[PDB]
Amino acid sequence: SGFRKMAFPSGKVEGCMVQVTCGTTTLNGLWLDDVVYCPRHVICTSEDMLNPNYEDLLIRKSNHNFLVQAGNVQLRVIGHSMQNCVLKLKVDTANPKTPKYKFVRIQPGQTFSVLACYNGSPSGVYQCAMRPNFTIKGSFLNGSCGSVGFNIDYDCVSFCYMHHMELPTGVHAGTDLEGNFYGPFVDRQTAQAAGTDTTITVNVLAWLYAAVINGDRWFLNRFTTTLNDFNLVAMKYNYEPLTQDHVDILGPLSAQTGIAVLDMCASLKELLQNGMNGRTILGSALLEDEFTPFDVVRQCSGVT
Amino acid sequence: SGFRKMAFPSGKVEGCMVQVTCGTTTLNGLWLDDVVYCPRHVICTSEDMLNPNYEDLLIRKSNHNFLVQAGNVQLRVIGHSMQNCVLKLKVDTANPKTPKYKFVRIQPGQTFSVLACYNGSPSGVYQCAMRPNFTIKGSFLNGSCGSVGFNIDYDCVSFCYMHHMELPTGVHAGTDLEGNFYGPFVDRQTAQAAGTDTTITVNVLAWLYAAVINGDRWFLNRFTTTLNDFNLVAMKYNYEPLTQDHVDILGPLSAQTGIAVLDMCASLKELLQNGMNGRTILGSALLEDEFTPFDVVRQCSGVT
Numbered sequence: 001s002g003f004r005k006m007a008f009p010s011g012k013v014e015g016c017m018v019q020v021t022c023g024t025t026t027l028n029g030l031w032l033d034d035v036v037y038c039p040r041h042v043i044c045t046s047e048d049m050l051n052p053n054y055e056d057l058l059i060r061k062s063n064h065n066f067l068v069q070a071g072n073v074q075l076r077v078i079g080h081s082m083q084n085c086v087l088k089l090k091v092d093t094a095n096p097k098t099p100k101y102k103f104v105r106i107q108p109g110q111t112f113s114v115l116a117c118y119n120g121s122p123s124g125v126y127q128c129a130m131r132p133n134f135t136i137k138g139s140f141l142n143g144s145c146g147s148v149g150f151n152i153d154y155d156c157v158s159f160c161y162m163h164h165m166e167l168p169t170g171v172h173a174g175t176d177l178e179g180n181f182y183g184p185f186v187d188r189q190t191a192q193a194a195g196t197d198t199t200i201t202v203n204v205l206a207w208l209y210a211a212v213i214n215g216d217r218w219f220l221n222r223f224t225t226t227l228n229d230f231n232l233v234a235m236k237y238n239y240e241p242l243t244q245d246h247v248d249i250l251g252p253l254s255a256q257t258g259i260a261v262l263d264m265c266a267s268l269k270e271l272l273q274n275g276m277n278g279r280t281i282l283g284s285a286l287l288e289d290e291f292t293p294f295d296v297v298r299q300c301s302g303v304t
Numbered sequence: 305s306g307f308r309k310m311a312f313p314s315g316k317v318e319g320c321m322v323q324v325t326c327g328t329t330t331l332n333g334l335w336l337d338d339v340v341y342c343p344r345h346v347i348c349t350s351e352d353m354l355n356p357n358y359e360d361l362l363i364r365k366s367n368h369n370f371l372v373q374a375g376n377v378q379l380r381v382i383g384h385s386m387q388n389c390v391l392k393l394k395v396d397t398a399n400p401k402t403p404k405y406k407f408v409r410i411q412p413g414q415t416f417s418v419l420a421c422y423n424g425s426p427s428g429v430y431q432c433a434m435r436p437n438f439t440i441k442g443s444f445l446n447g448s449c450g451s452v453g454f455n456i457d458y459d460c461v462s463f464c465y466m467h468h469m470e471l472p473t474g475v476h477a478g479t480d481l482e483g484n485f486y487g488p489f490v491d492r493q494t495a496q497a498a499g500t501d502t503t504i505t506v507n508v509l510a511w512l513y514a515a516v517i518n519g520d521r522w523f524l525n526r527f528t529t530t531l532n533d534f535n536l537v538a539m540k541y542n543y544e545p546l547t548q549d550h551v552d553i554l555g556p557l558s559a560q561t562g563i564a565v566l567d568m569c570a571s572l573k574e575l576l577q578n579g580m581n582g583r584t585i586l587g588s589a590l591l592e593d594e595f596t597p598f599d600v601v602r603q604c605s606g607v608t
């Protein structure tokens with residue numbers, strides 16, 4: 001029993017982290033096969049960041065200007081290219097620790113683990129979600145750029161995020177491993193405001209199922225609702241609309257607990273309208289929305 | 305910016321996890337050098353668990369009855385001994401992935417990372433604290449026994465916990481790596497109730513400092529207090545007494561923020577007496593107590 005914000009074991013990703021230096025800027029790289037992936041803003045002076053022309057800045061850079069260090073051993077850079085907002089540094093050595101991997105672009109609501117790194121060295125691991133506004137609420141200091149987000153399916157690491165920047169509101173923006181930003185964000189130190197950080201309704205419901213499985217049942221009530229009635233209340237509370245697809249995805253947790261998804265919706269409706277009244281659910285005083293239905297089943301079934 | 309419940313990178317510990325089977329029971333082992341450490345209850349039938357005599361049960365066990373598997377490779381057991389509540393299985397092969405390590409016995413309030421494992425395979429990593437009642441609030445299913453808790457200082461893993469059992473209240477009990485239980489718990493399926501789970505005051509204050517550093521300042525007030533006045537309020541709210549030693553330990557965060565520890569105590573006093581009024585601090589609706597002053601400085605300074 002018990003339910004924790006749980007990250008994937010980070011070992012497979014620790015084995016891929018390197019240091020990238022361009023001029024005075026040091027940040028992190030991901031070394032997979034003979035390619036090191038890093039934020040293209042590694043080439044920017046702090047001046048450049050206000051209005052960078054990456055193609056023009058890149059003309060002034062040669063292979064030998066990209067200093068790549070794996071542990072305390074230097075890698076030889078034999079090629080470099082820009083793909084969207086990432087640089088791909090071709091090195092002469094395949095990472096011997098390259099795991100089986102994929103690059104995936106996740107949807108808002110999806111969760112992943114972050115291995116926070118500084119100078120190519122792992123600092124810590126924590127669990128995040130892609131917010132509905134395409135920000136993530138990370139823990140990232142200056143030097144953490146190039147830190148990556150991932151999921152593991154058995155022995156295959158799906159890389160979904162690379163850390164690029166912090167907005168003036170202290171929320172985080174980054175790319176997939178093809179260098180495309182999540183959301184409308186750009187790698188420029190300009191005014192960029194995030195939109196509404198809505199609550200991931202399907203994730204809250206998953207977590208309420210987690211709570212029932214783990215013996216936390218006080219919030220279960222005598223009511224049901226409909227998708228349309230629930231959604232009226234969800235919109236009022238800046239919750240994402242619930243779709244039949246979400247209902248279908250909760251099907252396993254519905255079956256395991258014997259609680260109809262629309263009955264759990266009616267419980268969530270009352271929690272929104274009435275609050276927690278100083279009570280807690282799985283040790284939280286607010287409704288947690290960074291566990292997916294897949295996460296709750298994984299953690300409640302002990303997948304490795 | 306940002307502040308997350310962050311675990312140590314688990315790679316160094318993933319490299320030590322093995323499967324231990326005795327008869328029909330499979331659980332996890334920790335392989336360091338040529339010794340595999342596991343809960344002695346691996347030798348128990350579900351019947352045995354009600355009133356086990358471990359010395360008597362162990363007489364019926366030989367080296368060849370302890371099946372140890374590292375990945376999908378079998379280790380040869382050449383010796384076994386009981387130390388307190390752990391078994392030490394001597395194997396013929398030194399773990400080639402043995403990190404630099406120590407066994408430490410932590411105090412209540414201290415935090416550590418858990419690598420939850422099933423069948424010797426890492427499932428996930430999360431952060432815990434030794435509660436004042438010597439329980440931990442983990443996420444552990446049946447098969448998770450032998451999963452370990454640890455801290456890393458640079459390249460040295462300090463192992464502090466091995467998971468042994470879940471109490472009927474779904475809280476967790478375990479040993480240090482010398483096999484001594486934290487608190488009064490025993491490896492028998494008998495009535496064992498935990499005492500008062502008090503709040504780790506110094507940890508709450510550390511986290512309030514974390515909040516100020518990360519721009520969350522609404523709870524800072526115009527008041528101060530004294531240790532004795534604060535402690536009167538702490539006791540009333542089942543908070544641990546604050547000592548001068550705690551004040552001294554917060555000194556770094558006091559200095560970094562310019563907020564006197566007793567001023568932050570007066571802020572915490574008002575939060576206890578008045579509640580959050582539906583507000584949040586670092587995304588929490590309750591006062592977080594599983595970050596140590598050391599954790600807050602580490603995460604706010606980016607130690608690797």
Ligand SMILES: CC(=O)N[C@@H](Cc1ccc(O)cc1)C(=O)NCC#CBr
Nearest residue numbers: 041140141142164165166187188305
């Ligand atoms: C608001 C601010 O200082 N952002 C800086 C520095 C910084 C980066 C990551 C982080 O997690 C915290 C701070 C930034 O975004 N630099 C990278 C770029 C580009 Br183009």
Ligand SMILES: CC(=O)N[C@@H](Cc1ccc(O)cc1)C(=O)NCC#CBr
Nearest residue numbers: 001345444445446468469470491492
């Ligand atoms: C209440 C209950 O079923 N406890 C069992 C099974 C169990 C173990 C760990 C866990 O995390 C969840 C469940 C138990 O404590 N077995 C180990 C011993 C001894 Br001696």
